[PDB]
Every structure is written in C-alpha cells, then in structure tokens.
C-alpha cells in the first residue's frame, strides 16, 4: 500500500520535528547576548589581479596561501602568485564552459569542470615543463557544480543530475555514488578531518554524507529557495548555507537544528558564495548586488561591506592562515582584500 | 631595481603570458556566436547538417566570417541554473517544427507539441538575460505539413481560427502567432524562414541576419539609430 507508506513517512517526519523541538533549550542569541561585538570592519584592496577577459566563475586558494587558481569563460585556467602579481601558469582548456575549479592539497594537480559533464585533472609538475591533461573523469550526466580534492588519488564531484560521486583518479572509475537529493546539487565542502561532507541542492535542503559508508547521515531544511553555497565551520561541527532568498543560515551537526539566520531588509538579491574566516568568528558572503557582506557568526548583526566590483561577485575564498581574502566577480577582475 | 635575477625572469615570463593571453583574446573576440535552442529536438539535426555529451560546438566559416554554434539539447537539466552563461551571445537560433500541430506530446492527455514550442519560445524570448539578443526563427518540416493540413484543418491547435485550409494563409498564421509572443519589439527583432529538406540558402539567410544584427548593434552602440 503506497498510501500506508506515505502515512508512515508523514508520521516519522512529524515525530522527528517533535523530537527536534523538544531538544531545543535556548536560542543562540540568548547565549551570545553578553559577547562583545567585533565592531565595524574596514578592509583594503591590497592586490588587483587582472588578465582575464570574461566572467570569473571559480577560484581556490593554494595550501601555502600564496598561489591561487582561477577559471573564467575565456577557456583559460590561470595560476597566480598572490604576493607578486606574476602569472605562474596559464592552462588552455578544451571546453570554454567552465563553472568550477579546485587546487590539490599537495599542489601537484588542478581540477576543472563545467557544462561538458567531464572533470579534467591537470598535472602541474612534470619533466617536460608544460601543463598537460592528466585525467578526464566522465560518467556524470548533469553539469558539474563543484569538485574538491581529498588526496592525490581521490576526488569528490557533484553534478546537476541530483548526484554526487567519489572518483579514483588512477583507474578513473567511480567508487561511491551518493543519491537522494531531489533538486540539482550546487555546492559541497569537505570536513577539516576529511571524513564527512555536506552537499546543498536545489530542493531547499542540505545533506551530510559519509565518504566511507556512502550513506546519507543527516538532512537539514528550512530554506525557502535554492541553496547556492555551503561551507563547514573550522571546528567541523557546524556549517553555513547561503540561499537565493537573501538569507544565510547556520546549522549544527550535533544539535540537528539551525542556530541563527542572517538577513536584512535592504538586501533582496541572492547569495553566490559563503565562507568562514579563521576561528569562525566572521562570515563573508558574496551577493548579487556587487557587494560582499561580513556578518558575525555569534552576532546576527552586520560588521562591514566590501564594494569594489562593478559586476556580480561569483566566488570568494579565505587563506588557510587567515591572512587575506580573495574575491572574483563576473567582472574580469580578481581582488585581494586585507 | 631591488629584484633578484630569478624575480626578473619570472616577471618576463608573466609579461610573455600576458602577451599570449591578449593575443588569444583579440583573436577570439571577432567570432559570431549562435546558440541553437530547439523545441522537442525536432529538426535540429537537419539544420545542423545543412550548416556543416552535454553541449555540442559546431565551428564553420562563411564569407570570411567564423561562426560558432552551441547546442545544449542534451543537458536535460534546469535551464535557469546555467542560461546566464550564454548572455552576450550574438544570436539565438530557434527551431520550430510545423508538422506536430496534430500530434500530442506523450504522458499528457491533451497538450499539443506546438503549445510546448510556444511556451518555450515565450520563456526564452522574454528572458531577463536575452533582452538584446536577436532570435532567428526556423519553421521547418513544411512539406509533409502541406500534405497533412489537407486531411485535417488547422483548428485543433488554435480554436480561434477561421480561414482556408490550404497551405497559403495557414503557415503564415502560425508564423504570426509565434512572432506575436514578442513583448520587446523596440529592442529586439525576429527573423523567420521556411526551410525545406533540400534547401540550401539557410546558411545565406543566417549570414544575412547576422550581418544585419551586427550593423544594427554597431550603430546602436554609438548612440545613433
């Protein structure tokens, strides 16, 4: 009986909601009211990296917080030095429609993907002195939204067919397939210990996956629109989700409930990217109104804005040591803020 | 100069990379881009053939003009999540099959394929990204349409129709219905051509539409027109 199964599912979700309501004790603001606010934050543009000729769609800092890779619609993948302005590498892509990129933790590999449904892995250190394609991972049907390296031989990708995959680079075959999402998966992030990862989809929900078991652990909901960005807290026990209804939300893995929401009446446009700073006190979120807000994690109030882009900000990132921030926009200009 | 020899060599390498990048951009900025958006995958293959994974790129040359055609029929994903990647395309080529006015799309009781074509055309034409890009309509499969319309009059598709069942003043009715879906006639123009299976001048028609669009855009940028 299908109706009996639907009734059982409704009863289970109702009792899950009741248990979650009973688990809540006090709001986050009720505990953080005594905290001293960080005050207004004033950042300056230390560097302005230029050379791209189309919209920049992704970027990712290196493990040494000195090199960074960027991808644009030109069909080029540029590896920049950040202390100086010099371009270390410029890799021409086989497909001009790229919407994501990643930089390996060891620094020997780079990844890219987009509308071609194929994840290209490039090897940087070789005897011939030129960057050449090392692997072309294929098997996804929908477009590739994000990719994140775990080690030199394993990668995690998310596609537009409501699917995530764990690829072994050596053999090239899929290892574990994560399914269950209703809408297209837009972004993912790995835990600091590299044991679980959260994926946000277009069905106004997020999920927590275990790479080893391959089964979904927990599901979170509450957003009323598409979810575009997601990122773990530096502690690894919470994560922040940015959505298309001009709202950010903080979720806790152990509490299984949302803690705080960041929204304002003057902002109506959606959120493109969300990233925590070091120690997780700040939360930098890009917006469609050409600005980037700096919210407080413990205080719902704002703490500063970044306005230096003439077009939509499409990506942002924070260095491992927390020394500087970087923003790339639909205007062909990367900026470094400190 | 407070720079070491290795730093100077790195600066020289970066400058050479900049030169190569600007040369590539200058080379690639002088190409015409056409986004081929179909409706039910009807006639797209034939039109691609006559003009010689998830996206298919077709490159060709006509009258010293380089054309790049992008086909996204195999994405079958949510169109609103990646359509903004195509903002700035020179033209959008829309293909509409006239033959499926009687045909009914599967999994639905009464929902005509022409209604799907009109809905998709309305969605694409009035998109917030393609507010300036020009649409080139392509009404194909007109022959077996001509024999079919004799058997069944063109009234199932449009109840509010009154006229002769012959080919004349019937295909023009559907063309007018498609052209009337435009709501931005001040800043957009639609080109229409009836294409046969053995037609050859389709590439010439696309070239003429593209050069007209180029001229109009060039004169509109300067503040004239």
């Amino acid at each position, epitope marked *: 009986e299908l109706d009996q199964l639907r009734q059982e599912a409704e009863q289970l979700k109702n009792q899950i909601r009741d248990a979650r309501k009973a688990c809540a004790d006090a709001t986050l603001s009720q505990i953080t009211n005594n905290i001293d606010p960080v005050g207004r934050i004033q950042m300056r543009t230390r560097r302005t990296l230029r050379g791209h000729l189309a919209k920049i769609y992704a970027m990712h800092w290196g493990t040494d917080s*000195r*090199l960074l890779v960027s991808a644009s619609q030109d069909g080029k993948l540029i590896i920049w*030095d950040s202390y*100086t302005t*010099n371009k*270390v*590498h410029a890799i021409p892509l086989r497909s001009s429609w790229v919407m994501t990129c990643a930089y390996a933790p060891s620094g020997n590999y780079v990844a890219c993907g987009g509308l071609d449904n194929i994840c290209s892995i490039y090897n940087l250190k070789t*005897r*011939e*002195g*030129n960057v050449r394609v090392s692997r072309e991972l294929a098997g996804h049907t929908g477009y590739l939204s994000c990719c994140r390296f775990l080690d030199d031989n394993q990668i995690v990708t998310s596609s537009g067919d409501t699917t995530c995959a764990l690829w072994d680079i050596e053999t090239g075959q899929q290892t574990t397939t994560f399914t269950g999402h209703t809408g297209d998966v837009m972004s993912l992030s790995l835990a600091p210990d590299t044991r679980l990862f959260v994926s946000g989809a277009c069905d106004a929900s997020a999920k927590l996956w275990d790479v080893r078991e391959g089964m979904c652990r927990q599901t979170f909901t509450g957003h009323e629109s598409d979810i575009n960005a997601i990122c773990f807290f530096p502690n690894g026990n919470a994560f922040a989700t940015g959505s298309d209804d001009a709202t950010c939300r903080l979720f806790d893995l152990r509490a299984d409930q949302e803690l705080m929401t960041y929204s304002h009446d003057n902002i109506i446009c959606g959120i493109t990217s969300v990233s925590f700073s070091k120690s997780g006190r700040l939360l930098l979120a890009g917006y469609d109104d050409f600005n980037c807000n700096v919210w407080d994690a413990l205080k719902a109030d704002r703490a500063g804005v970044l306005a230096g882009h003439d077009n939509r900000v499409s990506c942002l990132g924070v260095t491992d040591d927390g020394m500087a921030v970087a923003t790339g926009s639909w205007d062909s200009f990367l900026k470094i803020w400190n | 100069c*407070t720079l*070491s*020899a*290795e*730093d100077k*060599a*790195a600066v*020289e*390498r970066s400058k*050479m990379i900049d030169r190569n990048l600007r040369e590539d951009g200058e080379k690639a900025a002088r190409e015409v881009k056409l986004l081929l958006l179909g409706a039910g995958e009807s006639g797209k293959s034939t039109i691609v053939k006559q003009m010689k994974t998830g996206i298919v790129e077709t490159h060709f040359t006509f009258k010293d003009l380089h054309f790049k055609m992008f086909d996204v029929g195999g994405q079958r994903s949510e169109r609103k999540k990646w359509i903004h990647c195509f903002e700035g395309v020179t033209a959008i080529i829309f293909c509409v099959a006239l033959s499926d006015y009687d045909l009914v799309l599967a999994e639905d009781e009464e929902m005509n394929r022409m209604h799907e074509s009109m809905k998709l055309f309305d969605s694409i034409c009035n998109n917030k990204w393609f507010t300036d890009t020009s649409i080139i309509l392509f009404l194909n499969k007109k022959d077996l349409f001509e024999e079919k319309i004799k058997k069944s009059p063109l009234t199932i598709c449009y109840p509010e129709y009154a006229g002769s069942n012959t080919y004349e003043e019937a295909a023009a009715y559907i063309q007018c219905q498609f052209e009337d879906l435009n709501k931005r006639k001040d800043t957009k123009e639609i080109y229409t051509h009836f294409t046969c299976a053995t037609d050859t001048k389709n590439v010439q028609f696309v070239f003429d539409a593209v050069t007209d669009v180029i001229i109009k855009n060039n004169l509109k940028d300067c503040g004239l027109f």
Partner: single-chain antibody
Amino acid sequence: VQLVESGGGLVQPGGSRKLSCSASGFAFSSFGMHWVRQAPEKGLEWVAYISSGSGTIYYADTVKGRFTISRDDPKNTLFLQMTSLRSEDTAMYYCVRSIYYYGSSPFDFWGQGTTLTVSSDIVMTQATSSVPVTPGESVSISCRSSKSLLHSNGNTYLYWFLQRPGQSPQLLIYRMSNLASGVPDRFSGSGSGTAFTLTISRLEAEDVGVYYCMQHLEYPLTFGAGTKLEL
C-alpha cells in the same frame, strides 16, 4: 628529455667556430638556456645565458665582445658562435636548461658537452680539495662566500652540483634546502649567510665525484673550486 651538442675539435688560434645544441623531449621555447665552460684540468665556469624569447642576453666578461649566442624556436636549437679564439678557450662546453617561476628548479638538466682545442664578481672559495673517507660514514663539504647570498624576500641563492668521473654535472640541492627531484634523500644542505655545508649521511659507490657550489644571486654566475671524494 635529452640534449645533444655538436662542434668543437681542433681550431687554429685566431679563427672562428660555431657550436650547436639540439634539444628533444621537452618544450624548448619555455626554457632559458645557458652555456657553461669547464677547463680540462679545472672547475666549471659560466659563459653565457639567453632568456626565453631572446628578451635578455648575458655574457661573461672573459668572452664578451667576441662571442654570440642565439636560439632557434621553430626548430629546437641553440647556437654559440665564437670569434678570435685564443689558447685559453680550449675546454669542455655544456648546454644547460633552466626555467624560472615560483617553485621552479633551474639548472635541472645538463647536456653531454663538446670539446674545443686551441693551439666586482662574487668570489666563492672551497678550502676542501680532497676528503678521503670510507663508505658508510657521514661526510660534510663546506663552501664559503664573500657576500650575503640571502635576499630581502627570504630566498637564498646557493646551488649544489655533483660531477661523477666521465659524466655530466647533476643538480643536487637548489637554494641550499630544496632537494632536487630524482635523487636519494641522503643529501642535505644547511647554512646561513656566508658559509654553507652539504651533508651526506651514508656514502655509496655512486657518490664518488666532485661537488661544486654555485651562486645565482646575480650575474656573472661564479662557480666554486670543487672538492673530490676519494676512497
């Protein structure tokens, strides 16, 4: 992947000669190129350098004004044309590659070399000339300078090269700390400012040769005297 050099032989003094160096197996256009001399009974000595794209060309003061360097990018070729040769130019010549970017390893690959017979600068001293030691015990080789090789950006410019008998010099450690690719982890380098030392934990039959310390702070690229490891 390899470099082959042609030319040399016997030359009447006062004449002219042209030496060629052909590369195969790597992107020749993106590598700066060096010509390095070695006297028949002495250590190495820098001669000339040409950048990628021929943007900058540098010559040693001994051969400046009569030597000419050139490159052929449509092909993969490097030319050195010498004029008004004298009795001091008889030596072995090596064709070396070097790429320059953040994290690169210059002087990675050296050519076979060709022989030619004819019938201020940063000085670096190597007091060691012969170190007899049994294999299996750690050894240290010291190299001093006359100027601070450390730079304001934190980089230091000291390279170590090994030349086994009847072979070509091999890069061991660049910037005195970064071990080169393809060598055992036995070699290590240390030092600060003026004096530096290279340490080998366990000697083997393949570690016998001559060790040179070379500076890349500024041109000309002065080499060390070199020390030998006898058994």
